[PDB]
From a paper:
The viral enzyme is a mushroom-like shaped homotetramer, while the bacterial NA is a monomer with two flanking lectin-like domains. Both enzymes share the canonical six-blade β-propeller fold of the catalytic NA domain, despite exhibiting a relatively low amino acid sequence identity of only 12% as revealed by structure-based sequence alignment.
A second common structural feature is the electrostatic and hydrogen bonding interaction of the 5-amino group of oseltamivir carboxylate or the 4-guanidino moiety of zanamivir with an electronegative binding pocket within the active site (Glu243, Arg 245, Asp250 and Asp292 in VCNA; Glu119, Asp151, and Glu227 in H1N1-NA). Another steric restriction in the bacterial VCNA active site is seen in the microenvironment around the 5-amino group of oseltamivir carboxylate and the 4-guanidino moiety of zanamivir. To rationalize the observed increased inhibitory activity of zanamivir over oseltamivir carboxylate for bacterial VCNA (IC50 of 52 µM versus 144 µM), we compared the inhibitor interactions in the determined VCNA complex structures. The 4-guanidino group of zanamivir, for example, forms electrostatic and hydrogen bonding interactions with Glu243, Arg245, and Asp292, whereas the 5-amino group of oseltamivir carboxylate interacts with Arg250 only.
Residue numbers in the entry: 51 to 61, 63 to 86, 89 to 802
The structure:
C-alpha cells in the first residue's frame, strides 16, 4: 500500500488535496512553490507538518512485512525537519537540520551523535532521503542519502504517536524545507488469498511497470489430485510496478468445463522478444496426481501453456504440449543389476533380415540391442562416454564408434536398424537412416532378438519405444512400447506375457513411463549468455520441471529453441543410489527447482530434495545445487554446495526462488529467497530470508530477513534497476507482495 504526496504543478498540489492532514501551530504555514513544483514547509514561529492516519491492521502489516519511506526535499534553513512513521507504540525518528555551519546533518532518537550528509551549496539542494524498515524479533531501520547507506540498525524507540508525518515537527524550533515527493510504502499487500497457493512472478523489461503473477486457485483447498478440490491457474497483472493489481483471472476453467481436472504449478517465462509472458502449468485428473505416486501414464496428466500479450493485455487460450514433453516408453534401469528381454525366433540365416529398435540412452553402458539368426549373433552396445558422448561398440569389433557428441542428441531417441545380407553373411548398422558400418558379428546358435541392460556390474539405463524384426516380407517380432505405455491397465503390457523371456540378475527397475511431468513452482528464464556454450543458443526458453517415472521424482529441463512453438526435454539430474535390501532403493528425489544463468552461460540450479536425503551415509540436506555447462541438457551435482551454503536457511523442505539481478552500471549478482525458520536455521516455514551471491553461486551472503511471521513458498524477480519484487505465501498461505530496494539493502552486508 502506497501513501504519498506528489507536487505536480496542478494548483491539487496541496497535500490536503492528496489525503494529508495539516498540523500547524502558531505562525507555522506552507505554500506551493515552483522553481519544478514543491510544497514549501514554513515552520517559522510554529509547527508546520502534514500527517496521515493508519488503521490497526495497516500498522500490523507494516510490522510484519516491513515498510519504506522515501522523501525528496531540500532543507532551506533551521531544523527539526522530521519525516517519520509512528505506529502508536514505537517510531524510528531521524531529525534532519542545518547545523551552525550550514551543513546538512542527521541525528536519530535512540542513537548517539550526528552525521553530516552534505556540505556547501549541496546542503540546501534537493536530495533523496530513504528509511527502510526490516521486520523481525529485534527489528531495525536503515537510513540512506542519495542512495548511500548512512546509518544502519536503527532500533525503534517508544512513542504513543500514531501517524505518518513530514515537515517541521516543532513549535519552538524553526525549520524550512521544500518537498517534491513523499512516499510511505507498507510492504506485503495480499494479492492471492489462502487456500490458493504456489506463487510465481515475472516482470516485463520492454514495458516498465508491468508485472504478472500466478497461483493455483484451489476450490476446496490442498494439493492437486484430491476429489474434494477443483484446482485452476489464476493470474493478476500490475501496470504500476506491483502496487495495484487487476482482476483475478482463472486461465484454465475454459478447459476444465466439468471440473474433471486439477491444474498446478504455474511456471511463467517472460519473453522480451515478443514482450509476452508464457506460463506453463501441469494438468491432472482431478482425482489423482503426484502425491502418493497415484498418477499413472494412462491418465490425463500433461503440460499446457497460456500466452499473455503484454501490449494488449490479451490472454491466449491454453496450448497442450504434452506429446512433446511427456515421454512414453518402456524403461530399464540396469543400476546394480542387469535386465534383458529375449524373444526366441526362427530367422533363416541364408535369407536377408532387418531389425529396427528405437532407443534412448539415459545413462551408463552395457545397453544392448541384439539379433541372432541361428548362425551368427549381432550385438550393438550403447554407452555414454567420459565427455558425455554417445558411443557404439559392436561385438567382435575392437574399435568403438562415436555416434553423437552433441549432448541433446546423445540422450534423444535414435533408430537403430540392422540390415543383414545373407550373400555377405554380414550386417550393416544404420542410425536414423545414416549408414554407420558393416560387421560379421560372432558365431552363435542362438536365434532371437534381445534388448535391455546386459551386465550386472555395469550401470546403464535405456528407454525403448519400438522393436521390430522382419524377414521375407513378414514382421516376426513387434513391440510398440510407445503405444503400450499410455494404455489403461486392461491392455496387456507385461513383456513376459507378450512372448518375451525376462533375464534379470541382481537388482533393477523397469516400467512403462513416464507417469507425469510437472513444470514445478516458480518461474523460468530465457538464455542470453550462450555464445560460447556448444550445442546451446541464445533465446532458449527453459524451466526445470519435475518428472515422475513411476515411483521416483527427479528434475529435467524443459526448453524451446523456437520461441515456444516446440518443446524438448533434457536429462534428469545425476544422483547416487544404493540398494539397502532387495528391491529397496536408497536414493535422492529432487523436485521443486529453480535455475539461473550465470555470467559464463553455465546454468545454476537449486532443487528441493524430498523424502530421503541420505545416500550411503552421505547427507545431501533439504536442498542441493547442480550445474549445467551445455545449456541445460545435462547437469552435475555440485559437491558440498547444498543447504549448507545458505547460512541460517530453514531445515525443512520447501520451495525456494533464485534470480539474477543487474545494476544500472552493468554489475550483477544472484538473489535467493527461502524461509529461515524461527529461530533462524530451524525447521519452520517462517521468516523469509534473502541471500546474495556475488561470485556466481560459489558462496552466499546473508540472509537479510524480509518477513516477520509465516513464510513458505516464494518467488523473486527483478523489478527495475534498483528493486526486486517478491511474492510470498504467509499467514493461512496468503500470498503477499514485497517490493525490495535491493541496491539499498545490499549495503547492509
Ligand atoms: C513435489 C514436492 C512435494 C512432494 C511431497 O509436493 C509438493 C509439496 C508442497 C508443500 O510442501 O507445501 C506443496 C506442493 N504443491 C506439492 N506439489 C504437488 C504437485 O502436489
Ligand atoms: Ca470450475
Ligand atoms: Ca481435484
Ligand atoms: Ca521455486
Ligand atoms: Ca514415490
Amino acid at each position: 500500500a502506497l501513501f504519498d504526496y506528489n507536487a505536480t504543478g496542478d494548483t491539487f498540489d496541496s497535500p490536503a488535496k492528496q489525503g494529508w492532514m495539516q498540523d500547524n501551530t502558531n505562525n507555522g504555514s506552507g505554500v506551493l512553490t515552483n522553481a519544478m513544483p514543491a510544497w514549501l514547509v514554513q515552520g517559522i514561529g510554529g509547527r508546520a507538518q502534514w500527517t496521515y492516519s493508519l488503521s490497526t491492521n495497516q500498522h500490523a502489516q507494516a510490522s510484519s512485512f516491513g515498510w519504506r519511506m522515501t522523501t525528496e526535499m531540500k532543507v532551506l534553513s533551521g531544523g527539526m525537519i522530521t519525516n517519520y512513521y509512528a505506529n502508536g507504540t514505537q517510531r524510528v525518528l531521524p531529525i534532519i537540520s542545518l547545523d551552525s555551519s550550514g551543513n546538512l546533518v542527521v541525528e536519530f532518537e535512540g542513537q548517539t551523535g550526528r552525521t553530516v550528509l552534505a556540505t556547501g551549496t549541496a546542503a540546501t539542494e534537493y536530495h533523496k532521503f530513504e528509511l527502510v524498515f526490516l521486520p523481525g524479533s529485534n527489528p531495525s531501520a536503515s537510513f540512506y542519502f542519495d542512495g548511500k547507506l548512512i546509518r544502519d540498525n536503527i532500533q525503534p524507540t517508544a512513542s504513543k504517536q500514531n501517524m505518518i508525518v513530514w515537515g517541521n515537527g516543532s513549535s519552538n524550533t524553526d525549520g524550512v524545507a521544500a518537498y517534491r515527493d513523499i512516499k510511505f510504502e507498507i510492504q506485503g499487500d495480499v494479492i492471492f488469498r489462502g487456500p490458493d497457493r504456489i506463487p510465481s512472478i515475472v516482470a516485463s523489461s520492454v514495458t516498465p511497470g508491468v508485472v504478472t503473477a500466478f497461483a493455483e486457485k484451489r476450490v476446496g483447498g490442498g494439493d492437486p489430485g484430491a476429489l474434494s478440490n477443483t484446482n485452476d491457474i489464476i493470474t493478476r497483472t500490475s501496470r504500476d510496478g506491483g502496487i495495484t493489481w487487476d482482476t483475478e483471472l482463472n486461465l484454465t476453467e475454459q478447459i476444465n468445463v466439468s471440473d474433471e481436472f486439477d491444474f498446478s504449478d504455474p511456471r511463467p517465462i517472460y519473453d522480451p522478444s515478443s514482450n509476452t509472458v508464457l506460463v506453463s502449468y501441469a494438468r491432472w485428473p482431478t482425482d489423482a496426481a503426484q502425491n502418493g505416486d497415484r498418477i499413472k501414464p494412462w491418465m490425463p496428466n500433461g503440460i499446457f501453456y497460456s500466452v499473455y500479450d503484454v501490449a494488449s493485455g490479451n490472454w491466449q487460450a491454453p496450448i497442450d504440449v504434452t506429446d512433446q514433453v511427456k515421454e512414453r516408453s518402456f524403461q530399464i534401469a540396469g543400476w546394480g543389476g542387469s535386465e534383458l528381454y529375449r524373444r526366441n525366433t526362427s530367422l533363416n540365416s541364408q535369407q536377408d533380415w532387418q531389425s529396427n529398435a528405437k532407443i534412448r540412452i539415459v545413462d551408463g553402458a552395457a545397453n544392448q540391442i541384439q539379433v541372432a539368426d541361428g548362425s551368427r549373433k549381432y550385438v550393438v552396445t550403447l554407452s555414454i562416454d567420459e565427455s558425455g558422448g554417445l558411443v557404439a561398440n559392436l561385438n567382435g569389433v575392437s574399435a568403438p564408434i562415436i555416434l553423437q557428441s552433441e549432448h541433446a542428441k546423445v540422450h534423444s531417441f535414435h533408430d537403430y536398424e540392422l540390415q543383414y545380407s545373407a550373400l555377405n553373411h554380414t550386417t550393416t548398422l544404420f542410425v536414423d537412416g545414416q549408414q554407420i558400418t558393416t560387421w560379421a558379428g560372432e558365431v552363435s546358435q542362438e536365434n532371437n532378438i534381445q534388448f535391455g541392460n546386459a551386465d550386472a556390474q555395469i550401470d546403464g539405463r535405456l528407454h525403448v519405444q519400438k522393436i521390430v524384426l522382419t524377414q521375407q516380407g513378414h514382421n516376426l517380432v513387434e513391440f510398440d512400447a510407445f503405444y503400450l505405455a499410455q494404455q489403461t491397465p486392461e491392455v496387456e503390457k507385461d513383456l513376459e506375457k507378450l512372448g518375451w523371456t525376462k533375464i534379470k540378475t541382481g537388482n533393477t527397475m523397469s516400467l512403462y513411463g513416464n507417469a507425469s511431468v510437472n513444470p514445478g513452482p516458480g518461474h523460468g528464464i530465457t538464455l542470453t549468455r550462450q555464445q560460447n556454450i556448444s550445442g546451446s543458443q541464445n533465446g532458449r526458453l527453459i524451466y526445470p520441471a519435475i518428472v515422475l517415472d513411476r515411483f521416483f521424482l527427479n528434475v529435467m529441463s524443459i526448453y524451446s529453441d523456437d520461441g515456444g512453438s516446440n518443446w524438448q526435454t533434457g536429462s534428469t539430474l545425476p544422483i547416487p543410489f544404493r540398494w539397502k535390501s532387495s528391491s529397496i532403493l536408497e536414493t535422492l528425489e529432487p523436485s521443486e527447482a529453480d535455475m539461473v544463468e550465470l555470467q559464463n552461460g553455465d546454468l545454476l540450479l537449486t532443487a528441493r530434495l524430498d523424502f530421503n536425503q541420505i545416500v550411503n551415509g552421505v547427507n545431501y540436506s533439504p536442498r542441493q545445487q547442480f550445474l549445467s555447462k551445455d545449456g541445460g541438457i545435462t547437469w552435475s551435482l555440485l559437491e558440498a554446495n547444498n543447504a549448507n551454503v545458505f547460512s541460517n536457511i530453514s531445515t525443512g523442505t520447501v520451495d525456494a526462488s533464485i534470480t539474477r539481478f543487474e545494476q544500472s552500471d552493468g554489475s550483477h549478482f544472484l538473489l535467493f529467497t527461502n524461509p529461515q525458520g524461527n529461530p533462524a536455521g530451524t525447521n519452520g516455514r517462517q521468516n523469509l530470508g534473502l541471500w546474495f551471491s556475488f561470485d556466481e553461486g560459489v558462496t552466499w551472503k546473508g540472509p537479510i530477513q524480509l518477513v516477520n511471521g509465516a513464510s513458505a513458498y516464494s518467488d523473486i524477480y527483478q523489478l527495475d534497476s534498483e528493486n526486486a519484487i517478491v511474492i510470498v505465501e504467509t499467514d493461512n498461505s496468503n500470498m503477499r507482495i514485497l517490493r525490495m530496494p535491493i541496491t539499498l539493502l545490499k549495503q547492509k552486508l
